[PDB]
């Protein structure tokens, strides 16, 4: 039970700047050396930066030296990263890890927050039912889903009966709309007989534009 | 900058089977070597560190070795959990600096996808335009063709198809075809068909309704 949670991800203007949080639990923060890390998407990993645990010793990529200031609050225990100057390849996942001792291979990651540099503008996904049909229908089970179109940027989430139902469910990568939107299927196969007795609900959240919605699917 | 390189890039095996993955670097980098695992979409993990050295609460069948610029990390009996890649990382001299990533898929026996068709919604068809889904599920492997027809018209306008990750549970791959028309189009014709090729499959397989 030690983790790192970043938060502080989403859309942002070129030219423009953002910062992240890498707020860490489990441990003694304060005496580690962390690092934050990126991955632009059809790309592997690349160091961002690292900070001492002094707080008082940074480095930086080639990429982002004078523009991106690593830093730390040891008190509130959390690690920061202030982009300045964003471009459209700075596109990608940040993860901060922390250092291991002896000293060098990152020890613990955190999940990983997608920033997306664009100047096109949020939108809000709609939700449509994928209803359960005897055409969506195979022997004691059953298929239904969501259908969530159109919303810009990348990450959309989708649970099934608020997490009651986790199972049964593939939810699928997203596509870009020859529009410059997304869209994605979120699907799950449920026992044929309940049909009629349970009532399934997907919860779709996009906090990007902050559109929360659910949809009751229902048969026919 | 010490610029790694990973072996096979790909590698599919069948779950029980020994798994093998290289790590060449451009330069000795001696002992120093990292190895991470990242099932998507999570945090990387370190398996291992210092080349032979196993990260604490990893599983035993993952070990590493080699030595100077060659490395091999190893999954002694490869399970389907296991799917991911698999990152190593250099630390010897500045910068720190990573593999390109090797993609371990679990080959498993065939299974053919139970193929699924979902008209509209009227709600949809309400604001403007009309998605027709056409659901794969639980196939293996992972190629799989699926063409549109509109009465019987072949269609090259215009679907969008998407693939999930291998089950970790039962290695298997689901996907979903949008068949993607104007409401104006979609009362313009009868029948509604996606036909899916599959190795999995004696022949192929069509799915229809009419409206």
């Known amino acids: 039970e030690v983790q790192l949670l970043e938060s502080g991800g989403g859309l942002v203007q070129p030219g423009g700047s953002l910062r992240l949080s890498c707020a860490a639990s489990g441990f003694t923060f304060s005496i580690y050396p962390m690092f934050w890390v990126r991955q632009a998407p059809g790309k592997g990993l690349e160091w961002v930066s690292w900070?001492?645990?002094?707080?008082?010793?940074?480095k930086y990529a080639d990429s982002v030296k004078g523009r991106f200031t690593i830093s730390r609050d040891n008190s509130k225990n959390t690690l920061y990263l202030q982009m300045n100057s964003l471009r459209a390849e700075d596109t990608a996942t940040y993860y901060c890890?922390?250092?291991?001792?002896?000293?060098?291979?990152?020890?613990?990651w955190g999940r990983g927050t997608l920033v997306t540099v664009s100047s096109a503008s949020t939108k809000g996904p709609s939700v449509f039912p994928l209803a359960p049909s005897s055409k969506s229908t195979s022997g004691g089970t059953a298929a239904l889903g969501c259908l969530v179109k159109d919303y810009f940027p990348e990450p959309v989430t989708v649970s099934w009966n608020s997490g009651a139902l986790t199972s049964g469910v593939h939810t699928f990568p997203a596509v870009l709309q020859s529009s410059g939107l997304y869209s994605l299927s979120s699907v799950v196969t449920v026992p044929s007989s309940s049909l009629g007795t349970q009532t399934y609900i997907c919860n779709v959240n996009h906090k990007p534009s902050n559109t929360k919605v659910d949809k009751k699917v229902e048969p026919k | 900058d010490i610029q790694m390189t990973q072996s096979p890039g790909t590698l599919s095996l069948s779950p029980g089977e020994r798994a093998t993955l290289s790590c060449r670097a451009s330069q000795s980098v001696s002992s120093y070597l990292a190895w991470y695992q990242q099932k998507p979409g999570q945090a990387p993990r370190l398996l291992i560190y210092d080349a032979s050295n196993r990260a604490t609460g990893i599983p035993a069948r993952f070990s590493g070795s080699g030595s100077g610029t060659e490395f091999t990390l190893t999954i002694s009996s490869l399970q389907s959990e296991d799917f991911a890649v698999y990152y190593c990382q250099q630390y010897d001299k500045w910068p720190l600096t990573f593999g390109g990533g090797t993609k371990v898929e679990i080959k498993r026996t065939v299974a053919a996808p139970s193929v699924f068709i979902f008209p509209p919604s009227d709600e949809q068809l309400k604001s403007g335009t009309a998605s027709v889904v056409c659901l794969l599920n639980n196939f293996y492997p992972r190629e799989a063709k699926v063409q549109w027809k509109v009465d019987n018209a072949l269609q090259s306008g215009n679907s969008q198809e998407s693939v999930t990750e291998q089950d970790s549970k039962d290695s298997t791959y689901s996907l979903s075809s949008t068949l993607t028309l104007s409401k104006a189009d979609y009362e313009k014709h009868k029948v509604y068909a996606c036909e899916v090729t599959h190795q999995g499959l004696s022949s192929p397989v069509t799915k229809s309704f009419n409206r």
């Open positions: 890890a922390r250092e291991g001792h002896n000293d060098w291979y990152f020890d613990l």
């Open positions: 900070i001492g645990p002094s707080g008082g010793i940074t």
